[PDB]
Amino acid sequence: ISVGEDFPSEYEQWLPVPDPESRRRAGVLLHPTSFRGPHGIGDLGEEAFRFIDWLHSTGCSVWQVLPLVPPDEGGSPYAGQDANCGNTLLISLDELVKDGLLIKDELPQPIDADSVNYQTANKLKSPLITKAAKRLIDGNGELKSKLLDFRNDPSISCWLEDAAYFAAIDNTLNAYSWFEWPEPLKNRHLSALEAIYESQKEFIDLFIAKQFLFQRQWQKVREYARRQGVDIMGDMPIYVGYHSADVWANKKHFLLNKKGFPLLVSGVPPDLFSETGQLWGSPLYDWKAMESDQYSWWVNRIRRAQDLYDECRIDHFRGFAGFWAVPSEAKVAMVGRWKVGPGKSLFDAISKGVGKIKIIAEDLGVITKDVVELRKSIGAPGMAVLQFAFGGGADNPHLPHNHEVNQVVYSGTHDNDTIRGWWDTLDQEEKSKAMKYLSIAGEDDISWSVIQAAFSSTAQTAIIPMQDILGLGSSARMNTPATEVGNWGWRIPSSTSFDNLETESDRLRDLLSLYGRL
Amino acid sequence: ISVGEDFPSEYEQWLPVPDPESRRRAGVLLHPTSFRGPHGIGDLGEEAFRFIDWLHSTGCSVWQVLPLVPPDEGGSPYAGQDANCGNTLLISLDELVKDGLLIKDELPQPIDADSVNYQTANKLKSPLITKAAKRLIDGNGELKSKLLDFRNDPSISCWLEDAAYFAAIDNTLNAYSWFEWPEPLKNRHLSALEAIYESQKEFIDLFIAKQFLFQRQWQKVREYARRQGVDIMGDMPIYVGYHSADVWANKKHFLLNKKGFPLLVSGVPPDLFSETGQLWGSPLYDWKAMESDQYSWWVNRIRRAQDLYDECRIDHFRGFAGFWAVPSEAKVAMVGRWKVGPGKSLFDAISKGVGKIKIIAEDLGVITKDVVELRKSIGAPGMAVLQFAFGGGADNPHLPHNHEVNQVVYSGTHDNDTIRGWWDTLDQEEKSKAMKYLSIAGEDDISWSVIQAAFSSTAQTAIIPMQDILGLGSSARMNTPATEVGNWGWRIPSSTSFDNLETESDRLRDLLSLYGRL
């Protein structure tokens, strides 16, 4: 219509429509090992479905988990034994009964494990998981046909075969790591791998069958989440452990010497958690090498993650701009150097290979100019953690008035204390600063005040740890960085069920309503 | 530095620097007619400088005024008698004593005017302002030389001459408006204008001298503001009155019939303020005609505003996308229709002619898709008013969780009640809704709770009316839309001075500090 002319009679109702991709929402951070149950550890069975139902009733639409990789021996998902495999100790045994692979009589006696012991859980559950996998590979029915489909899926076998062979070799040998393996296994000579197949054929087929079982139980949890309107946000650990099929089967893509030993290892300089810095110990990526077959190993990680999650947190995102390299012999991280990461070049390859992708940049720590620019050049939202909001002055980016829309706000991460515990240890200048910003009734319910401040944010997504919805103290902390004992063990108390959290559900629902996050 | 290589030793300190154009700030809305003083009305003398000093001590860096045009007879700046002229009743007489144009003995006896009466002020001040202008045009000194410079400034005369001639003709004739003027004055015949100059030469030179005096006092106020770090935000009324030099000297650029009578007039459909809508009564722009000499009249408005202000509010911004046209004979606005505005085409011409300009879009009312898009396509911030936040649900754009960064947040505008008065009339559903969002101590200090909510916003600029800093009731309301009597009259109580507002100053300074607006 030309300037000056009349509009049609429905001009007043030509109102702007809210973008569905801009929808405000809330979520809960809860790793599946924290579910209750009689087998020493949480699993992908009934408790997972009950939690989704409870989460649905709160109005939350996001469930954030830690990485689902097989953890290290202290329970850590961030130096896993493989990059793409699933933690087979998350397999529900009760579910294997529904699938026909176990009979009820075989299910073991319950144990009291108010925290996870990964070794206790392993001794109790692995015999039955192997028995179930044995019955699966023996059968000729529909489930066997689904296993064969899984195996020869081109994008499963490009990681699954190497991982089975690796697990098989490690079962044959007494060595501490693959560094000590004999040269022909260590460097993957065809005949040596052929011999391993012949002598460890059954073990290999069992390992592949256990990965199929994990895959199946997880995809069912995720379908049930989708059915109840819940997206699952996974977690992509930046580094993988030395003793893994990933490092072993792609030596030239890591920073190792001629004999396979790491030249440099991962960590961060002196920070909040340690005076000497955090020495993680992982091997590091030879980025110029990776660049040369298009980061195909990184592109397969993201493809695997797309199959497991709706959305994905990229751990230590800053590491792709610049990474901290410590000499491999060092006993502390504080002696080390910053090195140039792959930058945008990695993310263009992920785009080109995988397509459109929902990524959350965990951009916490030392944030330099090149990190901020990388995050913005791929469009990924960053993070705000309220527990870091009350040091410094009013320009602190974690304070609500400084949040952005394309961002996720946490009360805290799995690396922080709970709110209660954090408030208990808090320095007095930081505490009275926080009282001026927050709305506090009783200090008992400081959790709800912080949760309230997170939801009132302009940030599109607000994530709360289950510990803070339950108002738990420091004994419920999931992880303390720069410590080796007593992490990754927290479980929901055996006496709290998802049917006894109606008050919490309502109180949350009220807040999401109030801040337009339903 | 290539991928994999070491960074230099100052990598940790390559931290991102905050953009100075992103600086958060606060301000006060206060029209100069509201200043105290003995002459029935506020002026650009000592009270203006005292306010700037007080404003500086609070930490605010913005002073927002209403349009400074000569108002209509009820005091309204939004249907002024001219578009570019200054309200000569804002001239300080005490300042004219300092300039040598008046002697102290001539200054009149004080009057008690706790609200402005524009006619009382006109009777009292105009004889002395004319006396002062007479002494100015009679002189041969430095001030006369500055007047001559003002006159022949090419971008002053392209509006000032028409406005003097118009005022001169109106002084000669008994007519109500220029519609009733004889054809040769009405249509600006050369010989008829020549005759006016010869018979009204002195009046004309006096009018031009009064505009010089306004210009001088205003530029001194603005230089003092700049010295104290205070920007002045003006206001660009969208429409100008029928009886003005603007309409008269540019007939073909308005929607008038062959004889000069308006075909259509301005207003808005049925809304919050009136069941029949607001019939403003102004003539309307013939936009296709204006497009044809590049909107040169609009481009001169903005040029004039650049000379008076740092930044400018565009009143009824939505009107440039679509405008409501009511038949001229109508007694209510509710019978009318929406017509297509000039859109981006106007703003490209302003860019091309004036350069870079700091514009605030007053995008309140009925907001259609084409308004949101126009605002965004020129990059202008919009507005949020907290007084409209508590109708509807959690998607209401005036609620703090929905603010954007490129935005100005107000407790209220000059069109709203004060906070106190607003809270006093508030419906009970709206009131308990507000109590859940706001932090309220005593209801007396509801003003400070709303001021707090405005400052805590992510919006880059927060503006508060002086009435709310003083915690005043509805009697201090500046304007009620769709009313004709009792507006534009509010003045600071004669017993409140800027030296007795230390507590207010501190309390504000505390809030700006807390929300990073210092």
Ligand SMILES: C[C@H]1O[C@H](O[C@H]2[C@H](O)[C@@H](O)[C@@H](O[C@H]3[C@H](O)[C@@H](O)[C@H](O)O[C@@H]3CO)O[C@@H]2CO)[C@H](O)[C@@H](O)[C@@H]1N[C@H]1C=C(CO)[C@@H](O[C@H]2O[C@H](CO)[C@@H](O[C@H]3O[C@H](C)[C@@H](N[C@H]4C=C(CO)[C@@H](O)[C@H](O)[C@H]4O)[C@H](O)[C@H]3O)[C@H](O)[C@H]2O)[C@H](O)[C@H]1O
């Ligand atoms: C944890 C987090 O750290 C970095 O960000 C921190 C930052 O450092 C802090 O300063 C702070 O920053 C705030 C700041 O305080 C505020 O002032 C400011 O305003 O805001 C900033 C935030 O912007 O907090 C942030 C965030 O917490 C990183 O940047 C961040 O990405 C990190 N979080 C990630 C990353 C990892 C990486 O793995 C996870 O790390 C966890 O897992 C590892 C691995 O298990 C664990 O390490 C333990 O286990 C190792 C295996 C062990 N290594 C030994 C191994 C051997 C075998 O070879 C031995 O031979 C030898 O003895 C050792 O090498 C480690 O010793 C052991 O510690 C980490 O502890 C654990 O945290 C994080 O979970 C993940 O979220």
Ligand SMILES: C[C@H]1O[C@H](O[C@H]2[C@H](O)[C@@H](O)[C@@H](O[C@H]3[C@H](O)[C@@H](O)[C@H](O)O[C@@H]3CO)O[C@@H]2CO)[C@H](O)[C@@H](O)[C@@H]1N[C@H]1C=C(CO)[C@@H](O[C@H]2O[C@H](CO)[C@@H](O[C@H]3O[C@H](C)[C@@H](N[C@H]4C=C(CO)[C@@H](O)[C@H](O)[C@H]4O)[C@H](O)[C@H]3O)[C@H](O)[C@H]2O)[C@H](O)[C@H]1O
């Ligand atoms: C005022 C404001 O109105 C519009 O926006 C409103 C909106 O209409 C409201 O509904 C509400 O919207 C909210 C809503 O409630 C919420 O639910 C929702 O969530 O948010 C929205 C906000 O987005 O509030 C908004 C904002 O207040 C416009 O869109 C907005 O731009 C307007 N504000 C501007 C514009 C003007 C333009 O004039 C100013 O108007 C003021 O000045 C005029 C001029 O004096 C005054 O009019 C009086 O004086 C006239 C001379 C008189 N005319 C008579 C003349 C005659 C002869 O010619 C007579 O014969 C005849 O009887 C008359 O025509 C008028 O009668 C008289 O009223 C206005 O009253 C005065 O307000 C605003 O100050 C400025 O801020």
